Amino acid sequence: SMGKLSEQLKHCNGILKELLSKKHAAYAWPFYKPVDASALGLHDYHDIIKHPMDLSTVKRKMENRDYRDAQEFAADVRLMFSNCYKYNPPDHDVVAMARKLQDVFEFRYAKMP
Numbered sequence: 001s002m003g004k005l006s007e008q009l010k011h012c013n014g015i016l017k018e019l020l021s022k023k024h025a026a027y028a029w030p031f032y033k034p035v036d037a038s039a040l041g042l043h044d045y046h047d048i049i050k051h052p053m054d055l056s057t058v059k060r061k062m063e064n065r066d067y068r069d070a071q072e073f074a075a076d077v078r079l080m081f082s083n084c085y086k087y088n089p090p091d092h093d094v095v096a097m098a099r100k101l102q103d104v105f106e107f108r109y110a111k112m113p
């Protein structure tokens with residue numbers, strides 16, 4: 001009863017499915033679920049990152065029709081990557097992973113009809 005996604009949002013939904021797919025798992029896995037700061041001992045994470053975001057939250061928002069347009073979806077995906085660049089030193093392995101997954105995202109987002 002949620003309504004058909006617009007053409008641009010269908011493209012966004014396809015990108016999201018790709019980001020979650022097995023073929024990108026080697027670098028996408030840190031982004032699948034909310035950072036569990038407690039479990040990882042990152043007791044400063046929520047002081048530094050005011051707006052956490054991750055792919056499972058983006059998926060829930062897409063399914064719930066929270067995104068009004070492609071720009072709102074893109075801003076959330078980019079917020080997730082920016083959080084990673086903000087919290088971690090630039091030479092961290094997770095930053096390299098973020099950069100790889102963000103390239104997948106940005107190159108396909110640039111193909112939106």
Ligand SMILES: COC(=O)N1CCS[C@H](c2cccs2)CC1
Nearest residue numbers: 030031035083084087088093094
């Ligand atoms: C998007 O995930 C993050 O930014 N995290 C914060 C610290 S790096 C940690 C990792 C350690 C080793 C590889 S991934 C994942 C959680």
